[PDB]
């Protein structure tokens, strides 16, 4: 008769609702929110054993300048060339900064040294700069409060008239980008709120049903957030800002997906003519297993994502899986319970009018009757999408993805105004030999290295012991007595290890150091530095290269390999779930092909719109987030549609197709459009990267729902015929019943 689980869900509806409410309450009041608990235990985004990270740690260790890799710059310029008062206040400031040992570890005083001052001053003598080594790695809160402390300590005292002080670099950039995102949150939330309300009132043409759905979604979201913050607060699992953000997005998507699923099935059943009780029982018996399977498949894929090596995905594996499990549990217990309570108590969930089901049944009729031509049309559209993909570029510089009013951006603007290179993002090269280098022949080899580096296509300055101003284009001689001038000794500590076993040259690019060329250039720098010592006694030494472009090259390599790992894992799990659900080996293959084709076409359209037309290049994170969300949502919708189709096969292959279209195409379309436009309302944000991600996901779901899922896979099913269910044996048409 009535299965156990729905009867127990509905009979105890009110007590379980109260239990859910009290649990959410206690988990949200006693445990801080996700942003705070995430920030208190953030993790560095660079891998632990990447070639660049080891180099930065070792370089810091040898010269005794800390163990971190965060750094900042101070830019000093005036409307008149700097004078003696400039040196005076520079010295006072530098003493003050060196007084605070808590936050700044070590320093690089070039402009205060007459010999090297030329290399620490503009060509026209109007600007200067300094390098500060800061506590904490990239992305840890320690770096954030350290950079803020440096900003305060530098801005406390008033600069002399005529000059102005900035704070610049990458640390300031990340701090200010965090602040900028926090600022944009309010406006973006307001606009998305209004858009989602409009869309829900449009889909349902009621106020009460929309309010009930908002209730479902908010209860699910609060429960998930509170539970995950409870787990992460006691240091049980790891957390990160990127993890919390993607968790929020996935929670909203899944919760709305399941809520629409359930309510739509309920209203459809009521419209068929069943009473309230039987409608409840049939919605549960028709949607429960689909919801459970989709939830567990997404949880499994997002857990398998945890084997990745790049932390951006490593830290993202556990929390998202836990959140997804909580979401599915909540939407399987609390959902039908409150649907039963609301249906019983008064008259709130009530279908009105019937105009979408008939239209979608007509669309299904068109698909069934003429499946060939519609297929070629859909694949033609996918082709026009796909053909723009191979031309795809990506930019790692994050400077030009933010509004220009952040202080770091004015610092950069000043530096570019008075300098003709990218002097704010230098690099460091190191050579580690096994003998003392404070002698003449080793200096000749040092200069050979410096010149070999200078001659690479792209480098502008190479600052070394031989030439502190960074133009090694000259024949060299330094008689041995030079090791006694105290100024030379100071430069010697600045540029040579105190043991004498290491050398370092500061390398500054031309143009943007973070574009693709600035990434490909470091391999050549290393090759030239290796071949410069070939044949000299220094052969066999170890060469380290620490800098921003090195980090980004490592991240790009890890990114491609991790994308392929995640792709294989996700696609194979989709195969497994489709096989379990349908007991067909061709159906799962068709679904896999369609989903990968849809990802391809979606991203082709996105790159056509965003880089070719608007002339702005995509980020290096858009691909990962876009593919994660698209794959999850596609798994969900495809699973529902195929399960329904299997349910309605028995009365013929194709009238089953039109019935399944009428029944479920409308539900999947509604969910797709609501989520798609909720994401698409992000285009008005002033953090352009979020605009890119939102618009990509939006357009992708538009294309998926309105072209692929409604015209390509039903057409394929109606075209192949009984060969969609192999190895199971089915019939194209039932036995011909008489009149």
């Amino acid at each position: 008769a009535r299965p156990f689980i729905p009867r127990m869900i509905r009979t105890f509806a009110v007590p379980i609702i109260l239990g859910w409410l009290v649990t959410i309450a206690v988990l949200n009041v006693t445990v801080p929110q996700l942003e705070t608990v995430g920030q208190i235990q953030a993790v560095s985004m660079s891998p632990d054993a990447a070639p660049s990270m080891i180099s930065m740690k070792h370089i810091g260790k040898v010269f005794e300048e800390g163990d971190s890799d965060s750094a900042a710059m101070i830019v000093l310029e005036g409307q008149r060339p700097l004078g003696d008062a400039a040196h005076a206040f520079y010295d006072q400031m530098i003493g003050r900064l060196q007084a605070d040992t808590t936050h700044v570890q070590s320093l690089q005083d070039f402009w205060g040294d007459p010999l090297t001052a030329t290399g620490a001053q503009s060509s026209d003598g109007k600007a200067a700069y300094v390098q500060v080594k800061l506590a904490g790695n990239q992305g840890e809160s320690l770096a954030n409060e350290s950079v803020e402390a440096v900003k305060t300590i530098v801005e406390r005292l008033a600069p002399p008239p005529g000059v102005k002080v900035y704070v610049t670099g990458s640390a300031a950039l990340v701090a200010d980008q965090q602040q900028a995102g926090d600022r944009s949150l309010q406006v973006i939330e307001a606009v998305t709120f209004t858009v989602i309300i409009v869309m829900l009132l449009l889909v349902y043409r009621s106020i009460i049903t929309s309010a009930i759905m908002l209730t479902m979604v908010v209860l699910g979201l609060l429960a998930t957030r509170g539970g995950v913050a409870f787990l992460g607060f006691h240091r049980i699992i790891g957390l990160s800002t990127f993890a919390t953000n993607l968790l929020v997005v996935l929670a909203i998507a899944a919760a709305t997906d399941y809520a629409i699923f359930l309510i739509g099935r309920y209203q459809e059943a009521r419209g068929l003519g069943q009473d309230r009780e039987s409608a409840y029982y049939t919605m549960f018996g028709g949607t429960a297993h689909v919801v459970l399977g989709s939830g567990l498949t997404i949880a499994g894929a997002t857990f398998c994502l945890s084997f990745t090596r790049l932390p951006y995905f490593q830290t993202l594996g556990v929390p998202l899986a836990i959140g997804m499990v909580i979401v599915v549990a909540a939407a399987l217990t609390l959902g039908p319970a409150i649907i039963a309570v609301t249906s019983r108590f008064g008259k709130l969930l009530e279908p009105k009018r019937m105009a979408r089901v008939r239209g979608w049944r007509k669309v299904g009729a068109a698909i069934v009757r003429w499946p060939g031509p519609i297929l070629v049309g859909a694949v033609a559209l996918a082709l026009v999408g796909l053909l723009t993909l191979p031309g795809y570029r990506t930019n790692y510089n994050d400077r030009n993805y933010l509004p220009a009013d952040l202080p770091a951006n004015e610092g950069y603007a000043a530096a570019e105004r008075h300098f003709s290179q990218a002097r704010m993002n230098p690099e460091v090269l190191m050579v580690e030999s096994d003998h003392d280098m404070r002698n003449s022949a080793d200096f000749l080899v040092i200069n050979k290295i410096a010149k070999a580096i200078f001659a690479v296509e792209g480098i502008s300055r190479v600052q070394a012991i031989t030439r502190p101003d960074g133009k090694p284009i000259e024949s060299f001689y330094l008689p041995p007595e030079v090791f006694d001038n105290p100024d030379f000794q100071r430069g010697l500590e600045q540029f040579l290890s105190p043991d004498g076993h290491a050398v370092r040259f500061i390398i500054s690019h031309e143009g943007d150091p973070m574009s693709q060329a600035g990434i490909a250039r470091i391999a050549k720098i290393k090759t030239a530095a290796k071949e410069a010592i070939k044949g000299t006694p220094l052969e066999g030494s170890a060469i380290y290269l620490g800098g921003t472009a090195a980090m980004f090259k490592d991240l790009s390599d890890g990114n491609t390999y991790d994308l392929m790992i995640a792709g294989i894992s996700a696609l194979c799990l989709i195969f497994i779930i489709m096989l379990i659900t349908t007991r067909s080996v061709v159906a799962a293959a068709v679904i896999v092909g369609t989903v990968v084709l849809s990802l391809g076409a979606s991203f082709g359209l996105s790159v056509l719109i965003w880089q070719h037309i608007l002339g702005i290049e995509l980020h290096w994170l858009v691909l990962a987030m876009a593919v994660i969300i698209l794959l999850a949502v596609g798994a969900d919708y495809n699973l529902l549609l195929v399960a329904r189709l299997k349910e309605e096969i028995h009365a013929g292959i194709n009238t089953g197709i039109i019935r399944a279209m009428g029944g479920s195409g409308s539900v999947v379309t509604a969910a797709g459009l609501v989520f798609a436009f909720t994401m698409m309302s992000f285009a008005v944000s002033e953090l352009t990267v979020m605009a890119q991600v939102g618009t990509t996901i939006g357009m992708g779901l538009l294309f998926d729902t309105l072209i692929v899922r409604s015209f390509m896979t039903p057409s394929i099913a109606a075209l192949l015929g009984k060969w969609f269910w192999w190895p199971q044996v089915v019939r194209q048409r039932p036995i011909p019943q008489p009149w």
Binding site: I568, S569, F575
Partner: protein
Amino acid sequence: SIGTLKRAWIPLLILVVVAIAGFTVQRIRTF
């Protein structure tokens, strides 16, 4: 035999797919 092999083709197919995927993921990870 035939019966015990074709009565459980699904679990064996899933085992094969998981084995292949695990091998490939392990090999790719070491890079």
